[PDB]
């Protein structure tokens, strides 16, 4: 292609197509495996291993991203030696042959889910048995302890609660059979190979993995040692000012047009770009709380669970702006953008979206905030700080839980660990009591001071006031609009006259000429407080 490094797509299929025949072949297992590895080194090298110069090969990041891609291409395919095996275990472990055997003819997509769920259940044997190996099996304290502990270990309540009942001894010895069997099953379920043989060769390499994993580890470390202070009210204000402009007030016929609004909605809820723009689903729950579904990045739990999240302004107004944005022109292509551009588009549907919006949104954001350094996804980091500083010590929801739990749940994380990435911001001038503004107008006022004063004589007759009147009218509308030569020509004023005016109204309009056209001097102190 044009400025491409690797013809990726072709490559990726050059193998999914090859390794689909290699397993199709009449030859058998021993050699097939021998040829699969082959295929991979074919894939592997092409991208970053052999016959590659230096400043022309892709990066470790681009390498692992592409690997994920190839690997993912086999998701729906399990190890050749799998089923053969699952059977062997049914035979080997009876009390678990209903579940084990219920797998076989099932999609891989849900075997994996059934196996980890089972592994999870089995992994709880060790502790559960230790708890019992400390409980008087007699009817003295059994009733209590049992119904307390039994109700403490869900998928066992059926065999636990059945200890102190119509039966006793025999139903007990039963468990130990579920134990000694499930305990060694796990030992085998853990060792059991699941995903397709190829995957085991489509891995980076200790060398490559280790050094990436350390690099990343370093990047987020320097990050926690470099906080960026934000001015709460300035920020909050600028956001509220976006939310007000009537939906029509701004252009939405361009991908960039919906940047301000997109970033804002994201800045108020803390949801991820994709979540806002596409698969997120909200419904009001209170003035500042809204229920959410469609958390992204979940390695399929399968479940379409809902989490109650905070909203930094009327949650109703929020759900409507999201329903708005999702409609206006710029956002209608989505049902097609997703479908991709051909058999060589390896991106995900969500990825296809990112291909469009990301470039449209980030640039706006930098201007919006002042400095460049930070991006769109900062709305999360920001939001999470606010939500914290705003509701941790107040909402009786977190009475008995620590801050980490808070960041986790508010973010949708499956462990309090990943929220270590979301703490790069510090708030300067925060008040649980902040409120927006009604308004004033530096702009028109200034242009006014030079109203009639020098407008009848600024030109031959009328002109002087007709331009000024126009410019005023035009500013009163958008107290933040940039008046250029192109802004006034559509109105029909002597071309050699407009610029003559701008050079004049230069200070009242707050514009200066840079190394090109006319611009607007910086307004206030960009939410990002300098060092």
Partner DNA sequence: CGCGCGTATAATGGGCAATTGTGTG
Partner DNA sequence: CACACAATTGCCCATTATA
Which residues are catalytically annotated? 422
112 is in an annotated binding site: no
**Residues in contact with DNA, shown as a per-residue x/- string from 69 to 88 under the rule CB under 7 A:** --xx----------------
CA distances for 379 relative to 37, 159, 356, 427, 511, angstroms: 44, 48, 19, 13, 30
117 is in an annotated binding site: no
Q: Is 195 in the site for a second copy (CB under 8 A)?
A: no
d(CA 297, CA 280) in angstroms, rounded, equals 12
- How many Cα atoms occupy the beta-carbon half-sphere of 290 within 13 Å? 25
496 is in an annotated binding site: no
CB neighbour list of residue 68: distance below 8 Å, 6 or more residues apart: none
Among 71, 80, 114, 123, which residue interacts with a second copy (rule: CB under 8 A)?
A: 123
Q: Enumerate residues 261-290 that contact ligand VO4 by CB under 6 A.
A: 272
Q: Residue 498: is it exposed, middle or buried by C-beta count within 10 angstroms (0-12/13-18/19+)?
A: buried
- Three-state DSSP string of 96-113: CHHHHHCCCCCCHHHHHH
Which CB, 88 or 397, lies closer to a second copy?
A: 397
Among 241, 345, 395, 404, which residue interacts with a second copy (rule: CB under 8 A)?
A: 404
Q: Is 289 in the site for DNA (CB under 7 A)?
A: no
DSSP-based three-state secondary structure for 291: strand
Q: Is 417 in the site for DNA (CB under 7 A)?
A: yes
Among 262, 411, 508, 527, which residue interacts with ligand VO4 (rule: CB under 6 A)?
A: 411
Helix (H) or strand (E) holding 32: helix 29-48
Query: 495 is in the binding site of which of a second copy, DNA, ligand VO4, none (Cβ under 5 to 8 A by kind)?
Result: DNA
Among 64, 101, 116, 119, which residue interacts with a second copy (rule: CB under 8 A)?
A: 119
Q: Is 39 in the site for DNA (CB under 7 A)?
A: no
297 is in an annotated binding site: yes
Among 35, 358, 446, 463, which residue interacts with DNA (rule: CB under 7 A)?
A: 358
Among 21, 155, 167, 187, which residue interacts with a second copy (rule: CB under 8 A)?
A: 187
Helix (H) or strand (E) holding 406: helix 403-411
Long-range CB pairs of 53-62, under 8 A, 24+ apart, other chains included: 56/5, 57/5, 58/5, 58/6, 60/204, 60/208, 60/211, 60/212, 60/215, 61/212
Q: Is 205 in the site for a second copy (CB under 8 A)?
A: yes
Give the residue carrying structure tokens 């919906």: 258
Q: Enumerate residues 310-339 that contact a second copy by CB under 8 A.
A: none
Strands 425-428 and 228-231: parallel
Query: 124 is in the binding site of which of a second copy, DNA, ligand VO4, none (Cβ under 5 to 8 A by kind)?
Result: a second copy
CB neighbour list of residue 5: distance below 8 Å, 6 or more residues apart: 56, 57, 58
* Selection from 276, 273, 308, 264 nearest residue 289 by Cα: 308
Which CB, 287 or 426, lies closer to a second copy?
A: 426
Q: Enumerate residues 164-183 that contact a second copy by CB under 8 A.
A: 176, 183
Query: 401 is in the binding site of which of a second copy, DNA, ligand VO4, none (Cβ under 5 to 8 A by kind)?
Result: a second copy
* Selection from 183, 112, 120 nearest residue 153 by Cα: 120
Q: Is 61 in the site for DNA (CB under 7 A)?
A: yes
Q: How many residues bind ligand VO4 (CB under 6 A)?
A: 2
Among 20, 88, 517, 523, which residue interacts with DNA (rule: CB under 7 A)?
A: 517
Q: Is 184 in the site for a second copy (CB under 8 A)?
A: yes
Among 22, 46, 377, 472, which residue interacts with DNA (rule: CB under 7 A)?
A: 377
**Where is the binding site, in residues?**
272, 297, 380, 413
Give the interface with ligand VO4 as residue ranges (CB under 6 A).
272, 411
């Amino acid at each position: 292609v044009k400025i491409g490094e690797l013809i990726n797509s072709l490559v990726s299929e050059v193998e999914a197509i090859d390794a689909s025949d290699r397993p199709q072949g009449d030859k058998t297992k021993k050699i097939k495996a021998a040829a699969l590895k082959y295929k991979n080194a074919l894939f592997n090298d092409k991208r970053k291993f052999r016959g590659k110069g230096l400043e022309k090969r892709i990066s470790a990041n681009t390498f692992n991203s592409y690997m994920s891609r190839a690997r993912k291409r086999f998701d729906d395919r399990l190890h050749h030696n799998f089923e053969k095996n699952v059977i062997k275990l049914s035979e080997k472990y009876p009390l678990y042959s209903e579940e084990l055997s219920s797998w076989l003819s099932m999609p891989a997509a849900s075997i994996r889910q059934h196996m980890s769920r089972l592994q999870a259940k089995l992994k709880e044997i060790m502790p559960l048995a230790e708890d019992l190996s400390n409980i008087k099996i007699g009817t003295k304290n059994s009733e209590a302890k049992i119904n307390k502990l039994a109700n403490k270990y869900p998928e066992w309540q059926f065999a636990i609660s059945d200890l102190n009942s119509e039966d006793w001894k025999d139903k007990r010895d039963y468990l130990y059979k579920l134990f000694q069997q499930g305990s060694s099953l796990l030992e085998d379920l853990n060792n059991l190979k699941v995903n397709h043989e190829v995957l085991y060769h489509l891995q980076l390499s200790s060398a490559e993995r280790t050094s990436i994993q350390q690099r990343w580890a370093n990047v987020l470390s320097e990050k926690k040692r470099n906080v960026v202070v934000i001015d709460y009210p300035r920020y909050m204000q600028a956001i509220y000012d976006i939310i007000n402009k009537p939906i029509v007030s701004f252009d939405l016929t361009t991908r960039r047009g919906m940047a301000p609004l997109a970033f804002a909605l994201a800045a108020l809820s803390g949801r991820r770009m994709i979540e806002i723009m596409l698969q997120g689903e909200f419904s009001v729950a209170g003035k500042y709380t809204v229920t959410f579904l469609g958390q992204a990045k979940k390695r399929s739990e399968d479940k379409g669970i809902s989490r109650k999240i905070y909203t930094l302004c009327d949650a109703t107004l929020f759900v409507s702006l999201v329903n708005e944005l999702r409609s206006c022109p710029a956002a209608a292509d989505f049902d097609e953008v997703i479908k991709g551009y051909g058999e060589n588009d390896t991106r995900s549907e969500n990825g296809r979206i990112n291909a469009i919006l990301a470039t449209a949104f980030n640039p706006w954001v930098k201007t919006f905030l002042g400095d460049d350094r930070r991006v769109y996804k900062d709305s999360r980091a920001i939001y999470a700080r606010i939500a914290y500083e705003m509701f941790f010590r107040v909402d009786p929801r977190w009475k008995n839980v620590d801050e980490d739990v808070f960041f986790m749940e508010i973010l949708g994380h499956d462990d309090e660990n990943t929220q270590l990435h979301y703490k790069q911001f510090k708030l300067a001038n925060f008040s649980r009591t902040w409120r927006p503004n009604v308004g004033e107008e530096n702009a028109r006022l200034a242009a006014l001071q030079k109203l009639d004063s020098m407008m009848p004589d600024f030109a031959r007759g009328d002109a002087g006031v007709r331009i000024h009147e126009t410019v005023k009218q035009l500013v009163e509308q958008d107290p933040s609009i940039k008046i250029t030569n192109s802004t006034l020509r559509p109105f029909n004023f002597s071309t050699r006259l407009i610029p003559r005016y701008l050079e004049f109204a230069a200070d009242a309009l707050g514009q200066f000429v840079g190394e090109n056209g006319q611009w607007q001097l910086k307004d206030e102190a960009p939410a990002i407080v300098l060092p």
